[PDB]
């Protein structure tokens with residue numbers, strides 16, 4: 120069946136000229152609302168959540184791991200390094216790298232998390248260990264953001280990402296202290312106010328991770344604490360056929376607004 124919310128999302132998509140993917144889980148009842156929920160989309164920097172969570176998982180058996188230093192050499196800097204460039208020829212701890220990756224979207228910090236896991240396949244292996252059979256990370260930064268239509272690399276589906284984000288932030292994929300740390304990091308994101316957040320009532324609390332890339336790819340994944348309701352998880356993925364299209368965070372906001380009104 121096509122619901123009223125799905126029809127509105129289809130109209131939004133048609134007007135946008137791109138391809139939109141949405142998955143909502145409402146923990147009030149565990150019901151899901153999906154739009155293209157089983158289609159693959161490039162994750163771009165939303166994949167930073169999985170990498171940071173995988174390192175948090177390692178920290179459950181190594182109480183000092185998040186204090187472990189990692190060398191930042193000049194050759195490690197990639198194309199967006201607002202935090203890591205201040206540490207070149209020095210070090211950052213795994214906690215600092217995780218915070219920089221999640222809250223500033225630092226691509227050098229992401230590459231250090233990937234390396235701590237043994238490469239992109241180490242992130243995919245963690246995803247599988249927590250029940251996500253869909254996610255795949257194939258490349259490091261920055262090339263994981265090429266977002267080429269039809270390319271399977273570095274993709275997931277909205278449904279799979281919403282389920283995993285639920286398990287990570289509200290469920291028991293991580294130990295209690297690690298889950299609290301991930302939620303703290305997401306709630307302190309600096310990049311999210313024009314994306315899902317912009318479509319929701321201002322009284323609600325949001326933790327989110329954005330992403331963007333070529334093909335005008337514009338993404339956001341969020342855990343939401345509404346007013347007077349149990350938490351939600353919402354994934355909004357958008358990509359465009361025109362390679363040099365500008366990103367459209369407003370489309371993500373519009374999709375979130377449609378979802379919120381249909382609750």
Ligand SMILES: O=C(Nc1cccc(-c2nnn[nH]2)c1)c1cc(-c2nnn[nH]2)cc(C(F)(F)F)c1
Nearest residue numbers: 198199223224225310329330331337366367368
């Ligand atoms: O730094 C960014 N991107 C980037 C980095 C390096 C090269 C190119 C490039 N290559 N070719 N054209 N641009 C683009 C970037 C973009 C967005 C965005 N844009 N739109 N919606 N979100 C948001 C953020 C952040 F971190 F603040 F969340 C960063």
Ligand SMILES: O=C(Nc1cccc(-c2nnn[nH]2)c1)c1cc(-c2nnn[nH]2)cc(C(F)(F)F)c1
Nearest residue numbers: 164199224226261262264265329330331332333
């Ligand atoms: O690295 C990129 N982007 C980036 C970097 C850091 C944070 C965020 C972000 N975080 N949150 N939202 N965006 C986004 C990036 C962007 C483009 C692009 N954009 N437009 N045209 N080409 C192309 C590439 C590449 F290498 F694959 F070709 C990479």
